[PDB]
Amino acid sequence: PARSVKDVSPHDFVKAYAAHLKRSGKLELPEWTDIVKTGKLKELAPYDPDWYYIRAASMARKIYLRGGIGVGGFRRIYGGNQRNGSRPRHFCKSSGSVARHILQQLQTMNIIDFDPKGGRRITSNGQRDLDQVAGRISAA
Amino acid sequence: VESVQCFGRKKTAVAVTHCKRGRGLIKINGVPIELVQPEILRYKAFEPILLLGRHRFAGVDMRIRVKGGGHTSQIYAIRQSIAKALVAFYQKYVDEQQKKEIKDILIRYDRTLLVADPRRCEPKKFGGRGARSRFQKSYR
Amino acid sequence: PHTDVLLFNRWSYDGVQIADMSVEDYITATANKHPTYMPHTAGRYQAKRFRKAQCPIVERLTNSLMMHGRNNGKKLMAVRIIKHAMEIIHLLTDQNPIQVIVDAVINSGPREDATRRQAVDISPLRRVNQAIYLLTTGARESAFRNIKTIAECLADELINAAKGSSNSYAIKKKDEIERVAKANR
Amino acid sequence: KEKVNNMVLFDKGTYDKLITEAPKYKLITPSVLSDRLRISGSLARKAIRELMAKGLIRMVSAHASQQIYTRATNT
Amino acid sequence: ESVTKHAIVIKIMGRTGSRGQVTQVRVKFLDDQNRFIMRNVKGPVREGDILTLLESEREARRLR
Amino acid sequence: SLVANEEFQHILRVQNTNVDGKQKIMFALTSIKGIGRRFANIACKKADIDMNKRAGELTAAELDSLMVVVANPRQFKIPDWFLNRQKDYKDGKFSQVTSNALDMKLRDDLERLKKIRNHRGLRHYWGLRVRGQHTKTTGRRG
Amino acid sequence: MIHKIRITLSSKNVKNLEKVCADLVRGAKDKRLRVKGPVRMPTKVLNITTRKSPCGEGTNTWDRFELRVHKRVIDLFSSPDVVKQITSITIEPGVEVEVTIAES
Amino acid sequence: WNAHPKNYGPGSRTCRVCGNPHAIIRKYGLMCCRQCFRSNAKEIGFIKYR
RNA sequence: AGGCUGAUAACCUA
RNA sequence: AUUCCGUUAACGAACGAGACCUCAGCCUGCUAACUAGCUAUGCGGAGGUUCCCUUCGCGGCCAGCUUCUUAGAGGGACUACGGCCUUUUAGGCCGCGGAAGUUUGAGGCAAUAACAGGUCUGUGAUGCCCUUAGAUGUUCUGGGCCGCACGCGCGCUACACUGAUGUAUUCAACGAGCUUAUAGCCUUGGCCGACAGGCCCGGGUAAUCUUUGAAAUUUCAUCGUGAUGGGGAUAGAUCAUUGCAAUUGUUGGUCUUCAACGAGGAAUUCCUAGUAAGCGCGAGUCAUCAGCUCGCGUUGACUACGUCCCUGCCCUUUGUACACACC
RNA sequence: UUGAC
Ligand SMILES: [K+]
Ligand SMILES: [K+]
Ligand SMILES: [K+]
Ligand SMILES: [K+]
Ligand SMILES: [K+]
Ligand SMILES: [K+]
Ligand SMILES: [K+]
Ligand SMILES: [Mg+2]
Ligand SMILES: [Mg+2]
Ligand SMILES: [Mg+2]
Ligand SMILES: [Mg+2]
Ligand SMILES: [Mg+2]
Ligand SMILES: [Mg+2]
Ligand SMILES: [Mg+2]
Ligand SMILES: [Mg+2]
Ligand SMILES: [Mg+2]
Ligand SMILES: [Mg+2]
Ligand SMILES: [Mg+2]
Ligand SMILES: [Mg+2]
Ligand SMILES: [Mg+2]
Ligand SMILES: [Zn+2]
């Protein structure tokens, strides 16, 4: 067979493609990578030192699967439950600066572009890049 | 065009399996069924294949679309749509006696493989937070 | 008889026997009585009396793990716990984990009780219900505020109960129930 | 109710006990080692990885919540 | 001394006890199938199912 | 995994506080007043300290570099919004105040309000709630 | 020459709405016009839930009030003048007819 | 006289039927108090089914 | 002081 | 079920119950959809080996079609069928088949006679009484309704490892939405910002746009039985938003502070299946404010299939010095 | 006699 993104486990793919983005050296991490949290719903900053590449790999896989997602859509996708002390939990959005910065980097890498109807769309080069990485993952 | 389209239901989940003459492909929304999530419910979705055997599916291609419901109910809807689609395919394009044989196997194992569960959520009534549950009563 | 259905696709129902006349018809763990690949069926077992005796014994154990309130309805976690516990049981005992589970249920079911107080006999169905309740109550209590995981506690509870050892929480409670019953004869 | 005092790092005496006795256990989990060797669960998780690297124990089940290991060779 | 025996339920006499929590049944001993007695049973029981009697000498009074 | 060497310490002393040596360094620093989990984590990153090791494994030099970060956050580019004393009332400066300096700062805040007979200062003096909470039914501990 | 004209019908009364829809489709089939519909939009259920008591005493009972709106859409391929002729027929009470030239 | 702003809040809105300011139903633009609405519900077109 | 009682006494708990 | 069969000095009727109406459950049958889709086909992108295969995007009022969606009309269950039990009865138990075999589930409606039950503070419903210009009318400014030794009721969050945290991953339903004034409602997309929030271009008076629309859960890692990374009260500093106005913190952020609480005495509530419980969402209120209420779905059990012991209710017989009726 | 107990 010939595996593409849909044919491989999402967990395995994101790890492999994140190591691919870091290895290329094309993403320019912002100054505040080590300081920020990924939303006000969080208590602490991410544990993984390479969380930025992991998030960028995850966002590329979602644009590959569905076009037209904007920054607001990604804030919802990585949002979740916020705890409010002695009050009930409610849904909260995640950081827009993290989403916007990652999208603007993947676009300079030519993995995504502007969808005419709004949001971001995977490019032909982006499709090849993601599909080639998925093909190299060992069968597991 | 020897194809059938059978649905399965569980609560608000609806899965429709498009079963056509093929070579044995089985995919859910473009993803191979071997990657069904969650992984512990993967056994439930594979029961029709395990019960009948892969050799019964060698001459068909099943593409499944599922919507609504939740993680558990979508598996049961998918599980039901696959069984119904194969039975509808054998009746229409293979034989009546072969349809008789496989349907007996599916029924002897579990009747919900072919017959939907009619249970739905009971509406909430005022004076309590559930359908039955009432607000706590105090006297003094 | 023989069946191709394996629990979790790991454990065989062949060779599993219920060596107790009273509760044989109320434990569903053999190859002839509807073997199941997984202990998760959206069954309707409360529609009628004695209908839950057809529910597989492994799934009846899984349901009793969805306590207390914090764990209500978290059946995917419960199925995982029993899946891990059976793996642990196989390592420690070198026996079929399904066979060990039925032995634990048979040994931990009280056969006499007190009511009103005088001694009365317990029906085979309630005996199975009590055994399941006692086994999961002991595992839950030993896991609480303990480094030991719930799966390891459940495996040890079942291994001791299947052996008949007093180390089991369910064996001690069964003795206490039958000790008070004899005092009120 | 007394408080456990689980060591966060091995000492020469306990580390040698791990390399000799632990490979012989039928069931090896972080909580089994944590209780037998009086080590914290965090140290037990790292210790199990070392035993895996040395090839002294084989894996039976892997789950984020429950990890199950056993002696590589029986008896 | 008490000897454990197994007996099969023949007929359901009726629910007894203050709150109806007990059932009186007629049981036939399996070892000797010509002996019948009445027993009080806690929990759901139906005709046909088998019981374990820790002591078989006692007998329950009708409508106890 | 690794064996502890003789340099391992079970108790440390930082800014007149007892720091447990068996705790992960990130959570060992939180025992200092004015340093929470968010600030302890950023301090270890700016000091290039491996957060995977225990506080007792750190050398004396490494432990000191942590307190240099805490004392000069702006020098290490920790932003102003991340500090527990932003735009001080007297000096207007931004800083992270810890241990007794934090206790002195809290004392000066309440004394200032009480001195001008501010409403919030008076409720601090009377031992009442100051953040608009109803007091009819809760907070009954006297 | 031939244009897709959209007719929208709304009403609270289903029988009256279905009666007018049949009169229009059947009235257009007589002229041999191409007809698309009627298309039934999902029913809009306006809902007001209110306390029965005019005061606050007694068991707190609630009245659930519902006002259902049914909507039909019929597309006729013909000229505006012909459509104006078909729709000009007297319409049943409470049925709101709305003729627009589909923007396509 | 009447100088205080009345652009928002209960004081700005009143029942269209009776003029009372309490328990106004603003949904769908009804602008009736809950008591007047129940009296006039049938005439407005609202009905009880379940 | 709380609980039990429509309420009081009795009773039960702290 | 005062539901029926029968009995019978009654006969024949009227209400309530049932019927009924709404929602839900079955229909590969009917009607028919560019504001809902599917299948096929054409073109294009990517992967694998030019055909071919896998996957995604776009197009076609002359591809076809209605399985999935919507909503009209109908059909479908009657305990029909089998066994047994009951009086020839009325009916009941078990079972096949069946979407469904508790009046299939859940509601709405709902008799006679009552209560000195609640409401004059919903009403341009209202009698009498009071007040009516140093007003109990009305409006304006400010404060109060929230004030805190204490007692009680409905709740929310917890005491952790069946967990918290950080990743990765991923599936609902009910519903609601604007005066267009630069723009007053729901808001996509782009940009700026760590967050909170701001700017710009727009869509939608709506199966068309928001809506590509949740959480618990799943998954990997860290933590390791320590009031601990459990818990988040109390409190300091500071930033932003709503408003004419935020102090007695409106609310929302950031760092810091880090209380009780280790499962709860006597007592006591609710609940029999998609129910309990857990999990979040919409709506009402609303400039701003939800720990509340009314609905919605998601995950999904234990136990019982009884009894009149407790608390009550219905019918019959019976006792009564009670009729304001055993308070 | 009817109710209530
Ligand atoms: K998320
Ligand atoms: K107080
Ligand atoms: K292609
Ligand atoms: K009134
Ligand atoms: K009056
Ligand atoms: K009012
Ligand atoms: K706090
Ligand atoms: Mg600190
Ligand atoms: Mg206040
Ligand atoms: Mg259809
Ligand atoms: Mg119908
Ligand atoms: Mg009545
Ligand atoms: Mg009165
Ligand atoms: Mg008040
Ligand atoms: Mg209430
Ligand atoms: Mg916490
Ligand atoms: Mg979705
Ligand atoms: Mg703490
Ligand atoms: Mg307010
Ligand atoms: Mg309220
Ligand atoms: Zn009004």
Numbering used by the authors:
A (entry chain K): 3 to 142
B (entry chain H): 8 to 147
C (entry chain E): 23 to 138, 147 to 215
D (entry chain P): 34 to 108
E (entry chain M): 2 to 65
F (entry chain J): 2 to 143
G (entry chain L): 20 to 123
H (entry chain N): 7 to 56
Sentences reproduced from the published study:
Ribosomes are fundamental to all forms of life on earth. Their activity is regulated via chemical modifications of the four rRNA species: 25S, 18S, 5.8S, and 5S. The overall structure of a plant ribosome is generally conserved relative to its eukaryotic counterparts, including in regions that are responsible for the binding of mRNA and tRNAs.
By contrast, in the small subunit, both plant- and human-specific modifications are scattered all over its surface.
